[PDB]
Write a protein that binds this ligand. Structure first.
Ligand SMILES: Nc1nc2c(ncn2[C@@H]2O[C@H](COP(=O)(O)OP(=O)(O)OP(=O)(O)O)[C@@H](O)[C@H]2O)c(=O)[nH]1
Ligand SMILES: O=C([O-])C(=O)[O-]
Ligand SMILES: [Mg+2]
Ligand SMILES: [Mn+2]
Length: 615
């Protein structure tokens, strides 16, 4: 067998044998075990610079930061190539792509057979959740991509410290990744190796994750979406907890009372910006802190509360639109020690993306840039062709500790108590600004039936309304109808303690006017919606009952510092009967597709909403 170069601190015989089997299959030239040190990170970055995958940015403008640009075919998630290969198809559900496990194993085995020829297999040990904590889970990702290795260092607890927790007998999540571009001897590589054929496959029975053909973070950082959502949602279903596509934030009012909220928005629909928003004018004495921006693990306790942890260690966030007005905490976070992917390159060796001109002199575009495809870019080219300097799904990768608004409990394994949930899709019509569910069941209905317009975070036509229950359409690890039942059973467990359940809200920042522009300013101004939620949590906020729940009146929000009239508020909060009749018919189509094991409570809630519309 090939020399594994197993470090002395790896004491797990079962792990070593698994690496041996995977090395025998993928046939890498060499094997390197990542220790996760800062020194190793710098060596791997220099190796990426040598390969042309990375360009080191200007140390004076963006210290210890790098820029990568990808193949145009490998810029986002590929949902059609993502599979849940459960033993039974009914345990994948209509929202997932299924294939018989042995049939998929026969499909992938020749693809991974020799996939790493001419490359180095990097062994990437990582922990999701704080190292050695009772809620943490350890995985090992084998990858032939140093880009994956350095991004995993930022996004997870990565390296040799994992093996101290694993010991001689600890179990791990087996993760295999390849760019699917084996190299012949003497063959020159490309700067972004990938394959037109891609597979992202999950075997829930064995917790195996197999990724082929893509270097993009969503497809290749196997601890993130593949384990911490798809695999972990299965485990939580069996063990009584949740893995959710949710940010976690803390918010403290001027009276010193602190609350925590978890919000599920679909990919590229506002989680990162909300999770670290800065309270605008009129909110002196308020503070917003970040626990996480993408994934939450949640379980109930005996005290009747729901406790949430963020299992990740960094942010892998959409770049375009970020500036000092929309998200200054993020701007400050990516000041250094950041990996940028598919943004533009300035003449001075800095990065640039659409939206940064809002902080520029005269709010003007840069005179010249090199776009994410390596082409010359000018304001004239952009004005005449609409060419974007940064890809719409371009990303930054940055450690959570770079965030000035990072909550002191961001890595507390005890978690934070969730006082309210928020669900919200990208909807140009229909959905009002904010609505409070009348009960846990009606809140689960809200989350189960939410829709959202597609974004550049996955390949395909953007701007199309689709059902995205709980913002988990691309990430649910089992049948979506059983997942609905899981949320309903959780609420009953909480209610049996005698506790008051967390409120559930539906939000929409994205209503559009006749010109296609957003009616609600959003970003920092979303604090005015969050503050009403806090009022409702304290029992001091008023609201009016309407078809889908309780909404604030104009006088129930704080408008200090924002010129937003009562007429504008009426536009984004009015319940339009015709629009919601059409929307409920789209709910019925969803329920038809999800008929198997669909909870009866959802059809009962729908019938109640239909009555309120026909009243
Ligand atoms: N109009 C408007 N745009 C927003 C708002 N919040 C975020 N955006 C924009 O929407 C895009 C997505 O924002 P993010 O906060 O990164 O979305 P996300 O949910 O974190 O996306 P993922 O990381 O893929 O899960 C960015 O271009 C933002 O500039 C908002 O409140 N109003
Ligand atoms: O990468 C992400 O956060 C996504 O696609 O949801
Ligand atoms: Mg995000
Ligand atoms: Mn996400």
């Amino acid at each position: 067998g090939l020399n594994l170069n197993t470090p002395a601190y790896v004491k797990n015989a079962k792990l070593i044998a698994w690496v041996a089997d995977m090395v025998a299959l993928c046939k890498p030239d060499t094997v390197y075990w990542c220790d996760g040190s800062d020194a190793e990170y710098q060596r791997l970055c220099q190796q990426l610079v040598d390969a042309g995958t990375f360009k080191k940015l200007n140390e004076a403008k963006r210290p210890n930061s790098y820029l990568a640009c990808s193949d145009p075919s490998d810029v986002a998630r590929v949902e059609d190539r993502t599979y849940i290969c459960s033993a039974k198809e009914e345990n994948a559900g209509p929202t997932n792509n299924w294939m018989e496990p042995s049939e998929m194993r026969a499909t992938l085995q020749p693809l991974f057979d020799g996939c790493m020829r001419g490359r180095t297999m990097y062994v990437v040990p990582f922990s999701m959740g704080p190292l050695g904590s009772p809620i943490a889970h350890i995985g090992i990702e084998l990858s032939d991509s140093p880009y994956v290795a350095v991004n995993m260092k930022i996004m997870t607890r990565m390296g040799k410290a994992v093996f101290e927790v694993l010991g001689t007998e600890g179990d791990f999540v087996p993760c295999v990744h390849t760019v699917g571009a084996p190299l012949a001897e003497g063959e020159q590589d490309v700067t972004w190796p990938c394959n037109k054929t891609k597979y992202i496959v999950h075997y829930p029975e064995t917790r195996e994750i197999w990724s082929y053909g893509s270097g993009y973070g969503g497809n290749a950082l196997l601890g993130k979406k593949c384990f911490a959502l798809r695999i972990a949602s299965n485990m939580g279903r069996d063990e009584g907890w949740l893995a959710e596509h949710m940010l976690i934030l803390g918010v403290t009012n001027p009276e010193g009372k602190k609350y925590h909220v978890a919000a599920a928005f679909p990919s590229a629909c506002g989680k990162t910006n909300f999770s670290m928003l800065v309270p605008p004018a009129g909110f002196d004495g308020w503070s917003v802190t970040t626990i996480g921006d993408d994934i939450a693990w949640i379980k109930p306790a005996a005290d009747g509360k729901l406790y949430a942890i963020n299992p990740e260690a960094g942010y892998f966030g959409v770049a375009p639109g970020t500036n000092m007005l929309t998200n200054p905490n993020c701007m400050l976070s990516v000041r250094g020690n950041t990996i940028f992917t598919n943004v533009a390159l300035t003449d001075d060796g800095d990065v640039w993306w659409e939206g940064m001109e809002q902080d520029a002199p005269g709010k003007a575009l840069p005179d010249h840039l090199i776009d994410w495809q390596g082409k010359d870019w000018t304001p004239q080219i952009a004005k005449e062709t609409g060419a974007k300097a940064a890809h719409p799904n371009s990303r930054f990768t940055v450690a959570a500790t770079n965030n000035p608004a990072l909550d002191s409990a961001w890595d507390d394994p005890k978690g934070v108590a969730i006082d309210a949930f928020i669900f919200g899709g990208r909807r140009s019509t229909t959905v009002p600004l904010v609505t409070e569910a009348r009960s846990w069941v009606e809140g689960v209905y809200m989350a189960a039936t939410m829709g959202s317009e597609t974004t550049a975070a996955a390949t395909g036509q953007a701007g199309v309304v689709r059902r995205d229950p709980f913002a988990m359409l691309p990430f649910m690890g089992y049948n979506m109808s059983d997942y609905f039942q899981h949320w309903l059973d959780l609420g009953k467990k909480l209610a049996a303690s005698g506790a008051t359940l967390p409120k559930i809200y539906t939000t929409n920042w994205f209503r559009k006017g006749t010109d296609g522009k957003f009616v609600w300013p959003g970003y920092g101004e979303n604090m005015r919606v969050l503050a009403w939620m806090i009022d409702r949590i304290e029992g001091k906020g008023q609201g009016e009952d309407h078809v889908t729940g309780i909404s604030p009146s104009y006088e129930d929000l704080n408008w200090t510092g924002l010129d937003f009239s009562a007429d504008q508020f009426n536009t984004v909060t009015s319940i339009d009967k015709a629009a919601w009749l059409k929307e409920l018919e789209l709910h019925a189509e969803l329920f038809k597709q999800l008929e198997h094991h669909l909870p009866k409570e959802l059809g009962e809630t729908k019938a109640e909403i239909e009555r309120r519309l026909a009243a």
